[PDB]
C-alpha cells in the first residue's frame, strides 16, 4: 500500500528535478509528499539562496543568473549502490552542473561547463564509485567527464552526431550515450580515454585548458552501435549485464549485452553483434526502468502507456523462439516521459515502486487556470501486475527523479562551524578581528559597513547606525544547538531575508537607501537607523 | 476518508500561505496535494514572475524587491459565501497587499500600504460582499480599509495600542481587531460618515485619509479581554466572535448583536462578553463547524480543544455544565487552524486543518532545515480523528478552504486581458498585431522583437548589436488547454511561461557576442555582433 499514516515514516527519499523552478525537491516515497525544496539555480525567497553572499560565492561566474531549468538529479554511489553523499543536477538552460551535499541538504558547488552551449543528459559513474559525473553537450557534441569530488571538468570527448542521454556500466569500463545523424549508441572506453590523456593526445579551445579527445567514428576511444532512428533514453540494467536504448521514432527498444563490448572494442565482433534483443513494444518508447526480476518498464509516449516486458524472453524471441515477452501495458495519464523504480539505477533495485512522469494531466486534478500541473504517477510493481495507486500533481515540468532507500541518507541535524560553505565569511570576520560565536560588532570601512550579530531563540544586537547609501553587510550566526530551531533574518521593507540554520552563519549585502528607523526581526525586533 | 484515488477529484481548493517563499499554494483537499504555486512576492524561475515586464508593471513600486513573507490568503465573498473571484494576500516583510485573480490564477494587483512599516492580520469583508479588505499596520497602529475592486487604500483608522489580528461580521456594520487588553470594534457606518464630513488628516505628501479611532472616539469601542489576545474569529452564524487569550488560558466570546448597544451607550463594553471559557495553555486561533462547536489551538499544550459555544455561555452564567468536548494531541505546537468553508456561511464541519510549527520526528529527516506539519483532522463525527500529516515548506501562517463548485477558472487567456494590455499598446505604437506578426523593431540602442508560437516559433532568427536593450514579446497562439509554451534564451538567465493566448515579454542586455539559442522549454538563433 501507498498509505503512510500519521506517525509512520516513508520508506524512501525521492529526489525530484525542479524543472523550470530551478530547484531540487525531496519527496517521501510512497506518500509522494514534498518534504523539502533545495534551491540550486533559482533565487529562493525562503532561504535567501541566490541573495546571500555564501550562495553567490558558490554560484561563481553565474551569480548574476536568476533562473535555471534543473534536470537529471543523481546521487553518488559506491560499488553500484547509492552512498548518500552527493546529488548532482544540471541546468539545461545555462550549461551548469551543480552538486548538492546531502549531509546539510544544500548546493555546495556549481560550475559552468566550457566549450558547450547546452547540456543534456547527466548521470553518475556507478562502479567502483562515483569518481566521475557524465553529461552530453553541444558546440557536433562533447561528452563531458567531470571529477565529482573536485567539481571540475576532467576531460571532454568530441563525437560525430548529436548526443542526447547517457548512462554507465557496473564495471567502471564503459559509458554510453545515444546519438543521432539508422542512428547510434556511442560507447566510450574509460581506460583508453585516460591513457590518451596521460599520453598527451588532446587539444584545447579558447584560452581555457580543458583537454578534448577525438571520439569520432574511427577513433580507438569510441565504438558506435547502430540502433533504430532517433534513440532517446539509455538505461543500464541493475545486474550490469545489459543496457536498453529507447527507439522513440521506432516502436522498439534495443538491448545490448555489456559483456560483448570488449569484443566490439577488440574487433573480434562487429558493433551490431552487441545487440541481443530488439523487442517491439508500442508507439514512442522513451525511457526504461527495471525491477529486480529481469523485467523492464518502458514508457510509450504516444500510446500513453507503460509496457512491462521480460528481458530474457525478449532475447529468446530475437532468436526465433515463439515466446511472449510483453507482459502488460498499463494506461497512464497522459504522455509519459521518464520513469524510475525504487533504487532503480543501483544494485539495490527492489521492484516495489515505479514512478512515471507524465507531461499532461488534463482532467486528473481540479482545474487551476491556464497553467496546469503535470502528473507524476505512482505504480505498484510488487505483484505480477502493475497497479496505479497515486496521481501526484507536480509543478514546473520535472524531467527526471531518483529514489533511494532511507537507510542510505544520513543528514546532519546541525551545521558545524568549520563548514566550507561559510568559510570565506569566517575568514572575512577574522580579518576584522571578529569571533562569530561571541561577537556583536559593527565594523566601519569607508562607505562599507559590516554588522556581525548572534541569535539565540532574540538577537545579540538590538540596534545600529549607518549613513544613507552605505553598503551594509549583515552577518548572522545562529548559536542554538537544538534541531529545527531555524532562525530567520529579515530587514523590513528592504526585500532582504534569509535562513540562518542552527550553528550556521549567513550574510547578505544591501544598500541602506531608505532614511530613518528600519526594523529587523526573526522570521522563522531590532532597529537599523539610517541618517 | 481522506483518500482521493487516481481518477477521483478533490472536494475543495485550499489556498495556502507560502510563508517565506512569497508564493500562494493551491492544495486539493482532502488529498493535501499541491496543485499549483501562484507567484506573488518571489522571483519565480518557472513562470518568469518578477522578471517579465508584465509582472514588473503589476509589482509597481516594489518591482525591485526579490523576496516576501506571504500570509493570510482570503477569498472574496458575496453575502458571506466565497464567490471565487479574488484571493488577497499580504507580505508581512514589506508592507504589501496583493490580489490574485482566480479566473487566470495570477496576481493582478499589488500595492504598498502607506504610513505603515509592517502589516499583520488581513481579512475580507463578508457581507454584503467583499467591498473592503482589512488589515492592521504599525507606524501606534493603523487599521487599513482597502477597496478590494480598486486595490487602493480607502482609509485608515489610528488607534491606541498595537493591532494584531482582524475579522469581520456577517452584517457589513463592524470590523474587529485584537489590540494590546482590548478588542477594538470599528463601526463602518460611522467611519464612512466621518470621511464624507471631512474629519480626517493626511501624512507625508500622500493623500490617504486617516481617522482618529483612539479610545473616546465615536468610531471605535474597546472591549476588555484577558492579556495579549491573538486570534479573533467570527462564528459562521454571525452571532459571535471569539478572541483568543494566548497568555491567558481562556478565550472570550462576544455577542455581535450587543455591539449596537455598546456603540449607543446603552450597555458597557464588557457587557458584550457572553462567555469566557478556560481551555488550556496558549490559545491562538479558533475555527468553527456547522454545529455550534469551536476548535481552538493550544500552542503550549500542543492540542486542539473542541468546545461547544452555547455550553460555554451557560457555564459563564453559573450553570455547572461541561463545554469542553475533547482535546486531541497535535504534532507539534499548533498555530492557526481552519475548517472546510470555515469563514463563510457554508461551513460544513467535514475537515479541520491545523498548522503546526515543529514537525520533529513526524517525517524522514531532511537536514538542518525541516518542514512544518499541516495536519488534516476529520471533524464529521462526534470525535476528532487525525488522518494525515502534511509536510510543508517555508512556514505557512495561514490557509483557507473553499468548495470546488465556487471556483471556475478559465482554461485559456483572452487577448483583452489587462495583465498584458500595456504590452499590447506598446505593440500597437510599433504598428504590430501580436496575433500575426513576427517583426523586429529597431529604436536606437533598444530593440523590440515580436514573435508568435504554435506547438515552433514564427521567427527562426534575428540580429542585434552587442550591448543592445532587447525586449522579446512572445504570443502563444494555441487554443488547447495546458499546451503552455516556454521561452528561454540560452545562457542568459531568461525564461518565461507563455500560456495559451497570453503574451509575455522580457527585457535584457545582449552582453555575450555570437550565436545564442532560444527554444520552447515547457531552436531559434539570436546573433549578437
mmCIF file with all atom_site columns, C-alpha atoms in Angstrom, chain A residues 136-233:
data_model
loop_
_atom_site.group_PDB
_atom_site.id
_atom_site.type_symbol
_atom_site.label_atom_id
_atom_site.label_alt_id
_atom_site.label_comp_id
_atom_site.label_asym_id
_atom_site.label_entity_id
_atom_site.label_seq_id
_atom_site.pdbx_PDB_ins_code
_atom_site.Cartn_x
_atom_site.Cartn_y
_atom_site.Cartn_z
_atom_site.occupancy
_atom_site.B_iso_or_equiv
_atom_site.pdbx_formal_charge
_atom_site.auth_seq_id
_atom_site.auth_comp_id
_atom_site.auth_asym_id
_atom_site.auth_atom_id
_atom_site.pdbx_PDB_model_num
ATOM 1  C CA . UNK A 1 136 ? 26.408 15.497 -23.036 1.00 0.00 ? 136 UNK A CA 1
ATOM 2  C CA . UNK A 1 137 ? 26.806 18.976 -24.537 1.00 0.00 ? 137 UNK A CA 1
ATOM 3  C CA . UNK A 1 138 ? 26.700 20.845 -27.870 1.00 0.00 ? 138 UNK A CA 1
ATOM 4  C CA . UNK A 1 139 ? 29.023 23.281 -29.682 1.00 0.00 ? 139 UNK A CA 1
ATOM 5  C CA . UNK A 1 140 ? 28.946 18.471 -33.101 1.00 0.00 ? 140 UNK A CA 1
ATOM 6  C CA . UNK A 1 141 ? 28.738 17.192 -29.483 1.00 0.00 ? 141 UNK A CA 1
ATOM 7  C CA . UNK A 1 142 ? 31.037 16.888 -26.488 1.00 0.00 ? 142 UNK A CA 1
ATOM 8  C CA . UNK A 1 143 ? 30.831 14.094 -23.939 1.00 0.00 ? 143 UNK A CA 1
ATOM 9  C CA . UNK A 1 144 ? 31.911 15.612 -20.594 1.00 0.00 ? 144 UNK A CA 1
ATOM 10 C CA . UNK A 1 145 ? 33.565 13.719 -17.815 1.00 0.00 ? 145 UNK A CA 1
ATOM 11 C CA . UNK A 1 146 ? 33.503 15.723 -14.595 1.00 0.00 ? 146 UNK A CA 1
ATOM 12 C CA . UNK A 1 147 ? 35.510 14.942 -11.480 1.00 0.00 ? 147 UNK A CA 1
ATOM 13 C CA . UNK A 1 148 ? 32.740 14.508 -8.902  1.00 0.00 ? 148 UNK A CA 1
ATOM 14 C CA . UNK A 1 149 ? 34.892 15.319 -5.854  1.00 0.00 ? 149 UNK A CA 1
ATOM 15 C CA . UNK A 1 150 ? 36.734 18.296 -7.360  1.00 0.00 ? 150 UNK A CA 1
ATOM 16 C CA . UNK A 1 151 ? 33.703 19.556 -9.365  1.00 0.00 ? 151 UNK A CA 1
ATOM 17 C CA . UNK A 1 152 ? 35.920 20.330 -12.311 1.00 0.00 ? 152 UNK A CA 1
ATOM 18 C CA . UNK A 1 153 ? 35.761 19.024 -15.866 1.00 0.00 ? 153 UNK A CA 1
ATOM 19 C CA . UNK A 1 154 ? 38.339 16.263 -16.202 1.00 0.00 ? 154 UNK A CA 1
ATOM 20 C CA . UNK A 1 155 ? 38.038 15.901 -19.977 1.00 0.00 ? 155 UNK A CA 1
ATOM 21 C CA . UNK A 1 156 ? 35.764 16.059 -22.991 1.00 0.00 ? 156 UNK A CA 1
ATOM 22 C CA . UNK A 1 157 ? 35.357 13.634 -25.891 1.00 0.00 ? 157 UNK A CA 1
ATOM 23 C CA . UNK A 1 158 ? 34.198 15.059 -29.225 1.00 0.00 ? 158 UNK A CA 1
ATOM 24 C CA . UNK A 1 159 ? 31.921 12.883 -31.366 1.00 0.00 ? 159 UNK A CA 1
ATOM 25 C CA . UNK A 1 160 ? 30.138 12.594 -34.715 1.00 0.00 ? 160 UNK A CA 1
ATOM 26 C CA . UNK A 1 161 ? 26.432 13.389 -34.379 1.00 0.00 ? 161 UNK A CA 1
ATOM 27 C CA . UNK A 1 162 ? 24.300 14.740 -31.518 1.00 0.00 ? 162 UNK A CA 1
ATOM 28 C CA . UNK A 1 163 ? 24.395 13.249 -28.066 1.00 0.00 ? 163 UNK A CA 1
ATOM 29 C CA . UNK A 1 164 ? 21.172 13.085 -26.060 1.00 0.00 ? 164 UNK A CA 1
ATOM 30 C CA . UNK A 1 165 ? 21.104 10.778 -22.986 1.00 0.00 ? 165 UNK A CA 1
ATOM 31 C CA . UNK A 1 166 ? 23.788 8.884  -21.144 1.00 0.00 ? 166 UNK A CA 1
ATOM 32 C CA . UNK A 1 167 ? 24.439 6.013  -18.674 1.00 0.00 ? 167 UNK A CA 1
ATOM 33 C CA . UNK A 1 168 ? 27.255 3.976  -17.125 1.00 0.00 ? 168 UNK A CA 1
ATOM 34 C CA . UNK A 1 169 ? 28.066 0.286  -16.694 1.00 0.00 ? 169 UNK A CA 1
ATOM 35 C CA . UNK A 1 170 ? 28.581 -1.656 -13.392 1.00 0.00 ? 170 UNK A CA 1
ATOM 36 C CA . UNK A 1 171 ? 32.303 -2.315 -14.044 1.00 0.00 ? 171 UNK A CA 1
ATOM 37 C CA . UNK A 1 172 ? 33.896 1.117  -14.395 1.00 0.00 ? 172 UNK A CA 1
ATOM 38 C CA . UNK A 1 173 ? 34.969 0.432  -18.000 1.00 0.00 ? 173 UNK A CA 1
ATOM 39 C CA . UNK A 1 174 ? 32.303 1.972  -20.254 1.00 0.00 ? 174 UNK A CA 1
ATOM 40 C CA . UNK A 1 175 ? 29.969 4.936  -20.558 1.00 0.00 ? 175 UNK A CA 1
ATOM 41 C CA . UNK A 1 176 ? 27.294 5.116  -23.242 1.00 0.00 ? 176 UNK A CA 1
ATOM 42 C CA . UNK A 1 177 ? 25.270 7.837  -24.949 1.00 0.00 ? 177 UNK A CA 1
ATOM 43 C CA . UNK A 1 178 ? 22.520 7.903  -27.544 1.00 0.00 ? 178 UNK A CA 1
ATOM 44 C CA . UNK A 1 179 ? 23.481 9.913  -30.639 1.00 0.00 ? 179 UNK A CA 1
ATOM 45 C CA . UNK A 1 180 ? 21.787 10.902 -33.963 1.00 0.00 ? 180 UNK A CA 1
ATOM 46 C CA . UNK A 1 181 ? 22.696 11.970 -37.537 1.00 0.00 ? 181 UNK A CA 1
ATOM 47 C CA . UNK A 1 182 ? 19.940 4.098  -38.641 1.00 0.00 ? 182 UNK A CA 1
ATOM 48 C CA . UNK A 1 183 ? 21.422 6.071  -35.660 1.00 0.00 ? 183 UNK A CA 1
ATOM 49 C CA . UNK A 1 184 ? 23.917 5.085  -32.899 1.00 0.00 ? 184 UNK A CA 1
ATOM 50 C CA . UNK A 1 185 ? 24.848 4.442  -29.314 1.00 0.00 ? 185 UNK A CA 1
ATOM 51 C CA . UNK A 1 186 ? 28.397 5.685  -28.647 1.00 0.00 ? 186 UNK A CA 1
ATOM 52 C CA . UNK A 1 187 ? 30.347 3.600  -26.183 1.00 0.00 ? 187 UNK A CA 1
ATOM 53 C CA . UNK A 1 188 ? 33.269 5.335  -24.515 1.00 0.00 ? 188 UNK A CA 1
ATOM 54 C CA . UNK A 1 189 ? 36.150 3.242  -23.114 1.00 0.00 ? 189 UNK A CA 1
ATOM 55 C CA . UNK A 1 190 ? 37.275 4.988  -19.929 1.00 0.00 ? 190 UNK A CA 1
ATOM 56 C CA . UNK A 1 191 ? 40.548 3.060  -19.826 1.00 0.00 ? 191 UNK A CA 1
ATOM 57 C CA . UNK A 1 192 ? 41.517 4.170  -23.366 1.00 0.00 ? 192 UNK A CA 1
ATOM 58 C CA . UNK A 1 193 ? 40.446 7.770  -22.673 1.00 0.00 ? 193 UNK A CA 1
ATOM 59 C CA . UNK A 1 194 ? 42.624 8.053  -19.548 1.00 0.00 ? 194 UNK A CA 1
ATOM 60 C CA . UNK A 1 195 ? 45.516 6.531  -21.479 1.00 0.00 ? 195 UNK A CA 1
ATOM 61 C CA . UNK A 1 196 ? 45.184 9.064  -24.316 1.00 0.00 ? 196 UNK A CA 1
ATOM 62 C CA . UNK A 1 197 ? 45.171 11.902 -21.776 1.00 0.00 ? 197 UNK A CA 1
ATOM 63 C CA . UNK A 1 198 ? 48.315 10.733 -19.999 1.00 0.00 ? 198 UNK A CA 1
ATOM 64 C CA . UNK A 1 199 ? 49.909 10.279 -23.427 1.00 0.00 ? 199 UNK A CA 1
ATOM 65 C CA . UNK A 1 200 ? 49.065 13.939 -24.338 1.00 0.00 ? 200 UNK A CA 1
ATOM 66 C CA . UNK A 1 201 ? 46.694 13.125 -27.267 1.00 0.00 ? 201 UNK A CA 1
ATOM 67 C CA . UNK A 1 202 ? 44.272 16.039 -26.844 1.00 0.00 ? 202 UNK A CA 1
ATOM 68 C CA . UNK A 1 203 ? 43.723 19.694 -27.764 1.00 0.00 ? 203 UNK A CA 1
ATOM 69 C CA . UNK A 1 204 ? 42.293 22.797 -26.085 1.00 0.00 ? 204 UNK A CA 1
ATOM 70 C CA . UNK A 1 205 ? 39.945 25.573 -27.235 1.00 0.00 ? 205 UNK A CA 1
ATOM 71 C CA . UNK A 1 206 ? 39.698 29.301 -26.416 1.00 0.00 ? 206 UNK A CA 1
ATOM 72 C CA . UNK A 1 207 ? 42.117 30.128 -23.590 1.00 0.00 ? 207 UNK A CA 1
ATOM 73 C CA . UNK A 1 208 ? 40.583 27.526 -21.213 1.00 0.00 ? 208 UNK A CA 1
ATOM 74 C CA . UNK A 1 209 ? 42.586 24.374 -20.622 1.00 0.00 ? 209 UNK A CA 1
ATOM 75 C CA . UNK A 1 210 ? 40.045 21.529 -20.703 1.00 0.00 ? 210 UNK A CA 1
ATOM 76 C CA . UNK A 1 211 ? 41.522 18.539 -22.592 1.00 0.00 ? 211 UNK A CA 1
ATOM 77 C CA . UNK A 1 212 ? 39.410 17.443 -25.546 1.00 0.00 ? 212 UNK A CA 1
ATOM 78 C CA . UNK A 1 213 ? 39.798 13.984 -27.068 1.00 0.00 ? 213 UNK A CA 1
ATOM 79 C CA . UNK A 1 214 ? 38.764 12.861 -30.537 1.00 0.00 ? 214 UNK A CA 1
ATOM 80 C CA . UNK A 1 215 ? 35.992 10.262 -30.225 1.00 0.00 ? 215 UNK A CA 1
ATOM 81 C CA . UNK A 1 216 ? 34.736 10.432 -33.813 1.00 0.00 ? 216 UNK A CA 1
ATOM 82 C CA . UNK A 1 217 ? 33.999 7.219  -35.747 1.00 0.00 ? 217 UNK A CA 1
ATOM 83 C CA . UNK A 1 218 ? 37.427 5.670  -36.450 1.00 0.00 ? 218 UNK A CA 1
ATOM 84 C CA . UNK A 1 219 ? 38.745 6.637  -33.021 1.00 0.00 ? 219 UNK A CA 1
ATOM 85 C CA . UNK A 1 220 ? 40.100 3.958  -30.739 1.00 0.00 ? 220 UNK A CA 1
ATOM 86 C CA . UNK A 1 221 ? 38.250 5.603  -27.801 1.00 0.00 ? 221 UNK A CA 1
ATOM 87 C CA . UNK A 1 222 ? 34.717 5.013  -29.090 1.00 0.00 ? 222 UNK A CA 1
ATOM 88 C CA . UNK A 1 223 ? 32.555 2.423  -30.783 1.00 0.00 ? 223 UNK A CA 1
ATOM 89 C CA . UNK A 1 224 ? 29.215 3.153  -32.423 1.00 0.00 ? 224 UNK A CA 1
ATOM 90 C CA . UNK A 1 225 ? 26.455 0.559  -32.144 1.00 0.00 ? 225 UNK A CA 1
ATOM 91 C CA . UNK A 1 226 ? 23.719 1.033  -34.754 1.00 0.00 ? 226 UNK A CA 1
ATOM 92 C CA . UNK A 1 227 ? 20.274 1.471  -33.212 1.00 0.00 ? 227 UNK A CA 1
ATOM 93 C CA . UNK A 1 228 ? 16.894 2.304  -34.855 1.00 0.00 ? 228 UNK A CA 1
ATOM 94 C CA . UNK A 1 229 ? 16.352 6.008  -35.740 1.00 0.00 ? 229 UNK A CA 1
ATOM 95 C CA . UNK A 1 230 ? 16.452 8.760  -33.049 1.00 0.00 ? 230 UNK A CA 1
ATOM 96 C CA . UNK A 1 231 ? 17.149 6.775  -29.882 1.00 0.00 ? 231 UNK A CA 1
ATOM 97 C CA . UNK A 1 232 ? 16.280 8.643  -26.693 1.00 0.00 ? 232 UNK A CA 1
ATOM 98 C CA . UNK A 1 233 ? 16.807 7.010  -23.305 1.00 0.00 ? 233 UNK A CA 1
#
